[PDB]
Amino acid sequence: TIYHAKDAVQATKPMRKPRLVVFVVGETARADHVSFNGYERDTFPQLAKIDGVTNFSNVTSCGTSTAYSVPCMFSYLGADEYDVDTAKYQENVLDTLDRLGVSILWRDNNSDSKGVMDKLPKAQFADYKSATNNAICNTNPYNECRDVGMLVGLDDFVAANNGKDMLIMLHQMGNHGPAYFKRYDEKFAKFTPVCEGNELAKCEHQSLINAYDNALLATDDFIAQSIQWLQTHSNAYDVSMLYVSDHGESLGENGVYLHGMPNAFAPKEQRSVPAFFWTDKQTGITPMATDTVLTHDAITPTLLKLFDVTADKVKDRTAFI
Amino acid sequence: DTIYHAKDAVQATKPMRKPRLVVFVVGETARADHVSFNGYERDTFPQLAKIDGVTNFSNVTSCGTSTAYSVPCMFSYLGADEYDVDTAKYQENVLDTLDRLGVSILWRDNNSDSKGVMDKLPKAQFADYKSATNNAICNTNPYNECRDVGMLVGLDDFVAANNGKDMLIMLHQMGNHGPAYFKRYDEKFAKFTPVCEGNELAKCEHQSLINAYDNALLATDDFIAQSIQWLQTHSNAYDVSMLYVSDHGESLGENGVYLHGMPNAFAPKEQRSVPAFFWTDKQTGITPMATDTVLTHDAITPTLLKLFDVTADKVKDRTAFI
Ligand SMILES: [Zn+2]
Ligand SMILES: [Zn+2]
Ligand SMILES: [Zn+2]
Ligand SMILES: [Zn+2]
Ligand SMILES: [Zn+2]
Ligand SMILES: [Zn+2]
Ligand SMILES: [Zn+2]
Ligand SMILES: [Zn+2]
Ligand SMILES: [Zn+2]
Ligand SMILES: [Zn+2]
């Protein structure tokens, strides 16, 4: 195991108020389909009614796929030295925070870690793609488990870690294709018609867009209920929520669909991602400016600052806060 | 002791093949949004507009907002996110690499100093051009300020002295340095008037300050063009290319902010949005990146290496200008 932060120190310890953070790892969401970034439809109407939400209009993802971007999102090495083949053997930020006492839990309704959780106890990773753990899989014809199912019973995690610092990753299914029409329950079918087939190139363009934007409305609801769930502990915990998407998505420009293109050739749409940060006013955390130029490189500094941790390798590195 | 980052660096072909001669103009205080090619409403680069083969890069971000921070970073191997200005002078930089692989390195400075970038090479490869001892062009203006075009005089003696070798020539411009923009150019570029002729810029009328700044750009446009014109006189025997990047931008009164030097955490967009131009001769086989490519000062080191067919297993995937 190769270290990058054994100098890491937690300045104050939970004493002081414990801190509770949800990190929503998003999936396949494009920045230019976010209402706040100038999009022509209102894809985030619930987040708009929550005070304290910062939308970041200029964030660029590490890469264009889940396997590539996710480990880089928790890396110390930054996009320009990230190497997907050796990422799993590096100390990542969750290894650091777990070593300083923060309780880490990772619930996944997408796929896996991807390696990011592999040095921590297996009990701290939970698969939520199956109805064995996810209580919300019967809400749609496809028996697809839903991201909001990752919220059920999180109060049992808090009680089991009463008074400790806590960081909760919720890894979204989000907007992953090609079958966007299956990513959301029927209550979010606001834009119609939608394309209902797995060959995007036969979709009519607007039907494809409509399905994709309905999926964002489902993600907007999931994020909104994530913050509402944290508000039930604003009494005993300093609560914050952070959202960043792993990568964007192509929707037919120059004939390009889905994602996964090499960075040297990937179009703008595959790397321009939304990010949200919310925190309760009790907590004293100040978000950076909304138009700050940011990348996935800001996640690791952000996560460390959220828990008052210092490591002489990532400070002065721009964060979301 | 010097800390190395590219002792693996390898030159694929040697000068065999045609030798290569490159001028790298390190600019000063130039803003991307005052360049005509980037949509500015005045023609601040009328001579560069008449040269075939010039690529303008419309989305380049400087490492920092000052000479001390940006210049060493422009030649670093570490990238902005691991660059540490306090220790940059003990790092192998890209000029150390190219020098040990045989490329002849020259640094002429009409700005200040290196800043540390040249400190491991023989002092004969750095030349001060701020004074009339080396610069022949200083009596052209009330202030006896020596001019950037004086750095072009006698470069054929350097080429002759390194005949057939690969060569990279840094010319460190005085350029658009403030606050006295009106002093940076001779009267032949005093095209936009009235101009402000005082130090504390806030009393200036906005247009008169802008006018002095834009005349200063016309002087730079002339310096780059004649740099290209000088390289064209050796396109026969050498593959010639010119690269220009400014060290940082400049604030011109927006929200009351002038000059540069703000910490990156608070710096306005204008202090970091810089022009970059790359020119190359017909014969040379070098292809520019797309002009809207998102770039930073981190692209300079790979560019210089690729210009000399050098590969270094540390910047191998890093975006360049070419
Ligand atoms: Zn995917
Ligand atoms: Zn993904
Ligand atoms: Zn490194
Ligand atoms: Zn780096
Ligand atoms: Zn590899
Ligand atoms: Zn400067
Ligand atoms: Zn100065
Ligand atoms: Zn310092
Ligand atoms: Zn030599
Ligand atoms: Zn200066």
Residue numbers in the entry:
A (entry chain B): 23 to 36, 38 to 344
B (entry chain A): 22 to 36, 38 to 344
Lines quoted from the article behind this entry:
Recently, a new plasmid-encoded colistin resistance mechanism, mediated by the MCR-1 protein (a phosphoethanolamine (pEtN) transferase that modifies the pEtN moiety of lipid A), has been discovered. MCR-1 is a potential pEtN transferase that exhibits ~40% sequence identity with LptA, which contains three domains (intracellular, transmembrane and extracellular), with the extracellular domain being the active transferase. MCR-1 has been proven to be a phosphoethanolamine (pEtN) transferase which can transfer pEtN from the primary lipid phosphatidylethanolamine (PE) to lipid A4. We report for the first time the crystal structure of the catalytic moiety of the newly identified phosphoethanolamine (pEtN) transferase, MCR-1, which can confer bacterial resistance to colistin via modifying lipid A. Like its homologues in the YhjW/YjdB/YijP superfamily, such as LptA of N. meningitis and EptC of the Gram-negative pathogen C. jejuni, MCR-1 was found to exhibit an α/β/α-sandwiched structure and coordinate divalent zinc ions in the active site via phosphorylation of the conserved residue threonine.
After model rebuilding and refinement we finally determined the three dimensional structure of MCR-1-ED, which spanned residues T200 through I540, at 2.33 Å. Similar to LptA10, MCR-1-ED was found to comprise several classical β-α-β-α motifs which constitute a “sandwich” conformation, with one internal β-sheet layer and two ambilateral α-helix layers. Compared to the stable core of the “sandwich”, the interlinking loops of β-α-β-α motifs were much more flexible, despite the fact that three of them were anchored by three pairs of disulfide bonds (C281-C291, C356-C364 and C414-C422). Each asymmetric unit contains two MCR-1-ED molecules. The two interlaced molecules are almost identical in their overall shape except at the potential catalytic sites T285 is phosphorylated in chain A but not in chain B shown in omit density map as well, the structural details of which will be elaborated below. By sequence alignment and structural comparison (data not shown), the zinc ions in the MCR-1 were found to be hexagonally coordinated by E246, H395, D465, H466, and H478 and phosphorylated T285. In the active site of one asymmetric unit of MCR-1-EDs, there are four and two zinc ions trapped by chain A and chain B respectively, suggesting that MCR-1 exhibits the capability to attract zinc ions at different levels. After superimposing chains A and B, we found that insertion of the phosphate moiety in T285 of chain A led to a shift of zinc ion binding residues with a displacement distance around 0.20–1.96 Å13. Successful capture of both native and phosphorylated MCR-1-ED structures suggested that the MCR-1 protein, which contained a phosphorylated T285 residue, was in an intermediate state of pEtN to lipid A transfer.
